[PDB]
Design a binder for this molecule. Structure first.
Ligand SMILES: Nc1ncnc2c1ncn2[C@@H]1O[C@H](COP(=O)(O)OP(=O)(O)OP(=O)(O)O)[C@@H](O)[C@H]1O
Ligand SMILES: Nc1ncnc2c1ncn2[C@@H]1O[C@H](COP(=O)(O)OP(=O)(O)OP(=O)(O)O)[C@@H](O)[C@H]1O
Ligand SMILES: Nc1ncnc2c1ncn2[C@@H]1O[C@H](COP(=O)(O)OP(=O)(O)OP(=O)(O)O)[C@@H](O)[C@H]1O
Ligand SMILES: Nc1ncnc2c1ncn2[C@@H]1O[C@H](COP(=O)(O)OP(=O)(O)OP(=O)(O)O)[C@@H](O)[C@H]1O
Ligand SMILES: Nc1ncnc2c1ncn2[C@@H]1O[C@H](COP(=O)(O)OP(=O)(O)OP(=O)(O)O)[C@@H](O)[C@H]1O
Ligand SMILES: Nc1ncnc2c1ncn2[C@@H]1O[C@H](COP(=O)(O)OP(=O)(O)OP(=O)(O)O)[C@@H](O)[C@H]1O
Ligand SMILES: [Mg+2]
Ligand SMILES: [Mg+2]
Ligand SMILES: [Mg+2]
Ligand SMILES: [Mo]
Ligand SMILES: [Mo]
Ligand SMILES: [Mo]
Ligand SMILES: [Mo]
Ligand SMILES: [Mo]
Ligand SMILES: [Mo]
Ligand SMILES: [Mo]
Ligand SMILES: [Mo]
Ligand SMILES: [Mo]
Ligand SMILES: [Mo]
Ligand SMILES: [Mo]
Ligand SMILES: [Mo]
Ligand SMILES: [Mo]
Ligand SMILES: [Mo]
Ligand SMILES: [Mo]
Ligand SMILES: [Mo]
Ligand SMILES: [Mo]
Ligand SMILES: [Mo]
Ligand SMILES: [Mo]
Ligand SMILES: [Mo]
Ligand SMILES: [Mo]
Ligand SMILES: [Mo]
Ligand SMILES: [Mo]
Ligand SMILES: [Mo]
Ligand SMILES: [Mo]
Ligand SMILES: [Mo]
Ligand SMILES: [Mo]
Ligand SMILES: [Mo]
Ligand SMILES: [Mo]
Ligand SMILES: [Mo]
Ligand SMILES: [Mo]
Ligand SMILES: [Mo]
Ligand SMILES: [Mo]
Ligand SMILES: [Mo]
Ligand SMILES: [Mo]
Ligand SMILES: [Mo]
Ligand SMILES: [Mo]
Ligand SMILES: [Mo]
Ligand SMILES: [Mo]
Ligand SMILES: [Mo]
Ligand SMILES: [Mo]
Ligand SMILES: [Mo]
Ligand SMILES: [Mo]
Ligand SMILES: [Mo]
Ligand SMILES: [Mo]
Ligand SMILES: [Mo]
Ligand SMILES: [Mo]
Ligand SMILES: [Mo]
Ligand SMILES: [Mo]
Ligand SMILES: [Mo]
Ligand SMILES: [Mo]
Ligand SMILES: [Mo]
Ligand SMILES: [Mo]
Ligand SMILES: [Mo]
Ligand SMILES: [Mo]
Ligand SMILES: [Mo]
Lengths: 245, 268, 245, 268, 268, 245
């Protein structure tokens, strides 16, 4: 009754744009880790946008531009992060592939090589949903939509913190920030404060067909991505509420 | 609220942070194409019917553009329903079905555009920013394919694999995104009824209704895609839509003149 | 003196759109058969259009549109069938590839993976030949043009009937329909009635340079495609009248 | 014949079925761009000659568009003949040669378009549906590359690997497809002669001829691609073409005014 | 020099041969868009500043196009500097940085174009040959992204990995290529000073200077990319540029009227 | 301090357009040599333009067109040479790949197959540098820019002569033409006469980061390309003046 899995052997990894923003100090160890993972998994690596998107939001909001104008502008920053990450992995056979290629030709591309990189933003563009002046469907959301549409073996989200806390661990309430080893999408959706993942992510988890859990792990700690791809618990597990057939 | 506070929040907070979201809400509101009207021509309800439905609409479009700037998006119709049923039967997910449905709206845009070409009206991608045709009195209209771009990233419905955001949603979001003055859905019924008028014989016409009133009456999923009604409630620019019968001669023209033909559905 | 063969090791399979129109009941066994064929052959799988194209012809002809308007509209239905078929084979490494990729980059794509899927319609589009209000160069024709241009090892046409009969075996004269195990393109071209293959196919066979025969087999019978790809006679053989060098 | 019968045949029969083909033949005939004239500028015969040939044609085009809607397609010429000979020598098939030849017609379109740009005339893809430039008195013309789209799917000739459908065929089919009022081939000879006037000294000018008469005289393959003449006989819209000498000043302009310069070749 | 000699050299010599190069130098000089002015809107200096800088420039553009044909290219700005620093820190080469920077100029073109769309001014690729908008009094301007196309083939600077040819160079070369009458760089300073006026308090304004004079004063790398100044010296068509302060209301408009606001930098 | 090498295992081969212009007599032996090289190296094969570009320059200069108009017109001839060469290698898995694919996705394409072919012209197009009416950044220049940007293991230039001479060995001073086994880019840049390589090539060698030498070899002599790819000295070595780290 649930749709079939298009690429059940696929592993999807979303790298946060704010991880990319740290430059070589974060990116070189991540790249060395990805290199060693290449023989172990068939990877779609998707990059988020990070700080540049905040800058374009600052300019665009000042110009009065609607949320559909802002969505593709932020997406371009994720795409640029993807090109940067792919370039560092080029010597291992990895390249950036465009959204149409991801959507229609990922099978052949992962037959050619062990991993490809793409932008985690989904092409909502000018058809982004209205309501907030900030585009709701960002990189975590796009990555999950794909992973779930593919029926991938997993989606791992690589963050610049250990996982989800009860408050922003870098914010003004960071003293009350308690680490959450495990949570459900529904519990998260019913809390008010900030998250390290899009709120739209929790919405698409509610309608997910395949992916039972998503782990958010600290990409600043070498080994955590590798462990997460083996299903080891080293970050926050988010249960999507999908159940087995 | 200042630009400084907003810019600090934007740099220092997650985009999910409610304080940042509130600050962003206070931003100025630019309307990109405030003088344009977006019109959707139904696929099943109009274009699939062929010449008897399409030719008079073409003539109305040609007459109407003399006085009204139009973006004319196409629906999909029975060929998309056929693709959906084949693909659903194979267990394909909503995201693969979304891609299949765009091809059909594209076909319909192409047929409509070929009828309009000698009148100077192009089929475009990027209707909202086809700045030239929309600025010329000799043109003053474009045709576009009405499916949203989401493709494989289409959010599925709660049940089943039919893409919930199709051409009604595609055309509406374009109107909303470009701050258009008006959104007209051109279908094959005079507007909204208390029940499906094709099925029920004693359905009563509804000239005007809000989205909440529609939901309270269980018309959530009737003449417009139910996701469209939720979009309409969150809209910044287009806070009401009009549904008219394109099979009635001059109905589109009269709706463009501010005549209250059909049904007006309001966000609130 | 004849042109060289660009991809002599290629096998081309054209799946009829009316086979695709039968949905899962036809497509799942075909997909399972294709899966098992993947290790045996290097396949270009091309889909036809089927019934949706008839619908767009009904609308377009009613609008008065010329044959060049109708050709790309029908082609789009073949393309959609191709995406559907590719999606079912994605987990085996198969994807849909676009016409430019087929025309210029098939070699690299069949190096990456065992098979790819594409639309069998040729891009005649608005430059379709006039004379009939129905586009003459459809899926069988496009598939043959490619197979022959490539100098492929074969082209097999997968139909919803056993092969070619002396009349439509589903038509009003189906009682007189006699099965044809073997025929030549020239004999077919000189008969008047309906065929399960484009009439333009017979024309391009007359000018063919490489492909000596094309078998039309029933894709509704499991094993026939596999047998046909091994040169076993299980449908109608059409001799193109090409002769060996 | 009705729409019902046609639609039944379309659902229930093979497209090869003669009954379906006859029913489809009875369909209405829409002309997409009935006021346009398609013109082909020869590659070898005009553009390859450079400025002395191209500049006056540009001026005629600019003057002519004041009163005449034009689609101006380009030929290929000697660079394509060079590609064909290299590729043929390697044993490459007609379909690979077709692709090579488009690049040359594209180059020629680009050079012509750069001369016309300050006069408002664009080089387009999709000439037939470049609805905007064709609708504006300030523009009223477009340039296009004249090769057909067939590429690797090009049908080969009976002998050899030279693509039989090249820029004469490409431009003609566009005229035919869009139901244009007129098709003018601009070459470097006054029109058709009883023999090749470059070679034979006593060739006689032919003002008007049918395709059948041409074949009966063995002029099947002369100033137009022989496949074009067969296309012309099957055409629905353009049942005659005019071949004129673009090297003669004002010849294009005079042909557009209905002056019988050059040769008129009729389908029948 | 004749066409014959040139054509012999072109067939028989390497393109590096000085005799061929001299013969080619004697060729006629066609200006493609001689009535157009290319304008660059600074990314960091203008667009990054948001509404207070961009809105008045939009109004000037809209007023100015009534009398002046404009190609308006965008700069990149701080987002590109951010990409450059991340990528440079990873040891990526100049060619990879070039690609990253175009995306930012593209974003800026998109934001500017959305403000201009209701005034009929499109964002295009191919500004120089967007023949239609440039020919219509109702439009008479286009917006383009100002990065050159070089991407991975970008020639690196002598030191470091920052692409030396960015949006100043991109816009200038477009002006030069299309034989535009004028090239205006719109920045955030009144023009060139004897030192950086943001840093040095006693910098003196320079109304007019040649490239050689700038180099002799060590202003080679100041308000314009230093590679632009070398390009300007080799230019065939645009032998001077004007740098103006877009933050001053009407400054662009006054520069278009031939008022000597800002700094004029001459090739010689 | 120098940029990293993106594809250190890559070998780039630029085939002159005037080699392609000789047709089958030059191209068939080259193709047979390339075929045997395929298992030995990971190749990017880039074609130049040759004589057709001279023809389009003759037409364009007569029309008065500026150098930015002429650059993409010449480039198209290189692209067509590339398609011709790729077609001859198709049966070995080789295809033509477009400039965006070369620029962003070469890693995955050389994972799929042993070699790909592309146009050696760089996309300077309408932004070609002014000064000469002939486009300065042609096929040798484009090939070097790529090879060096990639940090390739080498760039070999395949010419229709033995290498660089002190004068055109086919020109009016060919009696004084002395063969140069080895030279530096700087020495070449300071001489006035004709070269078999773009003058812009010498400029980009001066700023190169990786490639220490480029050999120009006669593609009309079978074995020389193979030897050059093994670093054997069989043509003219051009030292770029890059030095090891
Ligand atoms: N409840 C929370 N738990 C953990 N982190 C939080 C929480 N709320 C806010 N944050 C903040 O979110 C930051 C991560 O930011 P964000 O999610 O915007 O980056 P990203 O995922 O790298 O960006 P992108 O979405 O562009 O890929 C953390 O460093 C943390 O400060
Ligand atoms: N309460 C109602 N009032 C009016 N119409 C209703 C109602 N409930 C159901 N309908 C039906 O909904 C139909 C409109 O949906 P339909 O999909 O035909 O529109 P469309 O725009 O043509 O869609 P598409 O363009 O994708 O084909 C009407 O034809 C009508 O039969
Ligand atoms: N002489 C014939 N022999 C066999 N089948 C025939 C003949 N004449 C007509 N037909 C009909 O053709 C049908 C196959 O239809 P068709 O060739 O249109 O489908 P398809 O090849 O799947 O479509 P497409 O060309 O879009 O791929 C058969 O089921 C049969 O009814
Ligand atoms: N009987 C004839 N009458 C007139 N011209 C003839 C005849 N037979 C041969 N020709 C030749 O055909 C030529 C026209 O073909 P040509 O290929 O030059 O046209 P073209 O449109 O320039 O082709 P392209 O555009 O692809 O270069 C004339 O120049 C003429 O020499
Ligand atoms: N001698 C000088 N005179 C004037 N300005 C100078 C001088 N030296 C340095 N500058 C600085 O150069 C700056 C212009 O460069 P800047 O990169 O801001 O322009 P831009 O067009 O916005 O670039 P981009 O568009 O890529 O962001 C001025 O803001 C000024 O601070
Ligand atoms: N100093 C030189 N040494 C060697 N050859 C020279 C020299 N000067 C000129 N040449 C000429 O250059 C010719 C090679 O021409 P060219 O470099 O234009 O061809 P190509 O490299 O095949 O073309 P493309 O650059 O389009 O790929 C040689 O055959 C030779 O006649
Ligand atoms: Mg995050
Ligand atoms: Mg069939
Ligand atoms: Mg050379
Ligand atoms: Mo793509
Ligand atoms: Mo692409
Ligand atoms: Mo697309
Ligand atoms: Mo693609
Ligand atoms: Mo699409
Ligand atoms: Mo599309
Ligand atoms: Mo179209
Ligand atoms: Mo089209
Ligand atoms: Mo367009
Ligand atoms: Mo377009
Ligand atoms: Mo598109
Ligand atoms: Mo699209
Ligand atoms: Mo697209
Ligand atoms: Mo757009
Ligand atoms: Mo766009
Ligand atoms: Mo756009
Ligand atoms: Mo446009
Ligand atoms: Mo347009
Ligand atoms: Mo493609
Ligand atoms: Mo593509
Ligand atoms: Mo193409
Ligand atoms: Mo492509
Ligand atoms: Mo592609
Ligand atoms: Mo093309
Ligand atoms: Mo093209
Ligand atoms: Mo062009
Ligand atoms: Mo172009
Ligand atoms: Mo266009
Ligand atoms: Mo365009
Ligand atoms: Mo194109
Ligand atoms: Mo094209
Ligand atoms: Mo294209
Ligand atoms: Mo089109
Ligand atoms: Mo199109
Ligand atoms: Mo179109
Ligand atoms: Mo257009
Ligand atoms: Mo256009
Ligand atoms: Mo781009
Ligand atoms: Mo782009
Ligand atoms: Mo845009
Ligand atoms: Mo856009
Ligand atoms: Mo455009
Ligand atoms: Mo466009
Ligand atoms: Mo683009
Ligand atoms: Mo682009
Ligand atoms: Mo592009
Ligand atoms: Mo262009
Ligand atoms: Mo273009
Ligand atoms: Mo162009
Ligand atoms: Mo245009
Ligand atoms: Mo445009
Ligand atoms: Mo246009
Ligand atoms: Mo591409
Ligand atoms: Mo592509
Ligand atoms: Mo691009
Ligand atoms: Mo691409």
């Amino acid at each position: 009754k649930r749709p079939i899995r298009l690429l059940p052997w696929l592993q999807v990894v979303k790298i946060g744009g704010r991880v990319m923003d740290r430059g070589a100090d974060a990116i070189l160890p991540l790249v060395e880790e990805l290199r060693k993972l290449l023989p172990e998994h068939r990877l779609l690596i998707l990059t988020g946008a990070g700080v540049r998107a905040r800058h374009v939001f600052s300019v665009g909001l000042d110009l009065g531009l609607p949320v559909g104008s802002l969505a593709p502008l932020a997406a371009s920053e994720a795409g640029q992060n993807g090109h940067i990450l792919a370039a560092m992995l080029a010597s291992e056979g990895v390249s950036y592939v465009e959204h149409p290629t991801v959507a229609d030709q990922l099978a052949i591309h992962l037959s050619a090589t062990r991993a490809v990189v793409g932008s985690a933003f989904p092409p909502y563009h000018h058809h982004e949903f209205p309501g907030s002046r900030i585009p709701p469907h960002r990189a975590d959301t796009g990555a999950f939509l794909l992973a779930d549409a593919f029926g991938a073996a997993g989606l791992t989200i690589v963050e610049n913190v250990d996982g989800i806390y009860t408050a922003d661990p870098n914010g003004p309430d960071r003293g009350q920030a308690r680490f959450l080893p495990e949570t459900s999408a529904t519990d998260l959706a019913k809390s008010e404060g900030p998250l390290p993942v899009d709120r739209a992510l929790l919405d698409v988890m509610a309608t997910a067909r395949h992916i039972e859990r998503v782990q958010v792990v600290n990409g600043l700690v070498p080994g955590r991505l590798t462990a997460a791809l083996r299903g080891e618990h080293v970050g926050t597990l988010i249960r999507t509420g999908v159940r087995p057939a | 609220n200042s630009t400084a506070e907003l810019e600090e929040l934007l740099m220092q907070r997650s985009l999910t942070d409610p304080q940042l979201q509130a600050a962003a809400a206070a931003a100025a509101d630019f309307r990109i194409l405030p003088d344009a009207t977006v019109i959707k021509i139904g696929g099943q309800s109009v274009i699939d019917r062929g010449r008897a439905a399409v030719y008079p609409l073409v003539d109305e479009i040609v007459a109407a553009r003399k006085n009204h700037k139009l973006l004319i998006g196409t629906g999909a119709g029975t060929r998309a329903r056929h693709l959906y049923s084949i693909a659903a039967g194979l267990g394909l997910p909503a995201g693969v079905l979304a891609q299949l449905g765009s091809s059909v709206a594209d076909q319909n845009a192409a047929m409509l555009g070929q009828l309009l070409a000698k009148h100077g009206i192009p089929v475009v991608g990027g209707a909202g920013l086809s700045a030239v045709p929309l600025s010329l009195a000799e043109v003053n209209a474009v045709v576009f394919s009405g499916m949203p771009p989401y493709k494989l990233w289409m959010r599925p419905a709660a049940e089943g694999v039919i893409p919930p955001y199709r051409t009604d949603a595609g055309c509406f979001l374009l109107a909303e995104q470009f701050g258009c003055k008006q959104m007209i859905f051109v279908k094959d019924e005079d507007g909204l009824y208390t029940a499906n008028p094709k099925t029920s014989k004693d359905a009563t016409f509804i000239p005007r209704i809000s989205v909440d009133e529609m939901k309270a009456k269980g018309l959530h999923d009737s003449i417009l895609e139910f996701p469209v009604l939720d979009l309409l409630q969150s809209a910044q620019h287009v806070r009401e839509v009009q549904v008219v019968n394109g099979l009635v001669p001059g109905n589109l023209t009269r709706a463009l003149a501010g005549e209250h033909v059909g049904t007006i559905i309001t966000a609130s």
